[PDB]
């Protein structure tokens, strides 16, 4: 199915983590199409900045055959 390749940077705002936090601070990952809205809203209410998003798999305007 169609997948989104995203790149984001989230800050810590409530506490100072004492462990290594690069992997969850600045990261790139593949999120599915049907889960990208909720994943995006989770990041966007968390307070991060999504610096990049692209459609990694599939093509735009896919009426049928998106699965």
């Amino acid at each position: 199915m169609r997948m989104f390749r995203i790149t984001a940077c989230v800050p810590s705002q409530t506490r100072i983590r004492t462990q290594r936090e690069l992997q969850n601070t600045y990261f790139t990952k593949l999120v599915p199409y049907d889960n990208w809205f909720r994943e995006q809203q989770r990041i966007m209410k968390m307070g991060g900045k999504i610096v990049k998003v692209e459609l990694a798999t599939g093509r735009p305007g896919t009426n049928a055959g998106l699965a």
């Binding site: 705002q13 409530t14 506490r15 100072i16 209410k45």
Partner: protein, 160 residues
């Protein structure tokens, strides 16, 4: 701010604002004038409160201003009164916003390890905030002192 908190809760439940929260916005908007009155009283009496509370802190803990302490010297006492002024400015921001969120976001997270790295006694800064509370309550209106004392002892509980 309670406006920010209500918007955060509404977006967390993914809905518009409930009428009880709208009435909370009504009450906050109504009380904002009195809260702003507290704000200009505090920023009109900011110099006297900071100076006399710092003097009372110096008489309470003479080892702070003594040689060998953190606040020995004119530049060190300047940094100490700058910290007092910054904390009182945060209390003015808090009585403006009606919430402890600006204090917690600007000057109250990681202050323990910050003053640990600076070598400053966090008990001494908490005592300084307590004396600023006492001077502000003496110099300032009493129900308004009960309003500002929530932010004051929130700072006390967070630092100590």
């Amino acid at each position: 701010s309670i406006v920010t908190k209500s918007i955060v809760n509404a977006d967390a439940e993914a809905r518009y604002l409930s009428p009880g929260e709208l009435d909370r916005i009504k009450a906050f908007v109504t009380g904002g004038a009195a809260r702003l009155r507290i704000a200009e009283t505090l920023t009109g009496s900011r110099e006297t409160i900071v100076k006399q509370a710092g003097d009372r802190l110096f008489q309470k803990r003479p080892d702070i201003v003594s040689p060998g302490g953190n606040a020995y010297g004119e530049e060190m006492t300047a940094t100490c009164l700058r910290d007092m002024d910054y904390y009182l400015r945060l209390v003015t921001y808090g009585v403006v916003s009606g919430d402890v969120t600006p204090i917690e976001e600007i000057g109250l997270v990681g202050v323990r390890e910050m003053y640990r790295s600076l070598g400053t006694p966090i008990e001494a800064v908490a005592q300084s905030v307590r004396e600023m509370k006492e001077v502000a309550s003496g110099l300032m209106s009493s129900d308004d002192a009960a309003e500002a004392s929530a932010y004051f002892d929130f700072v006390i509980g967070k630092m100590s």
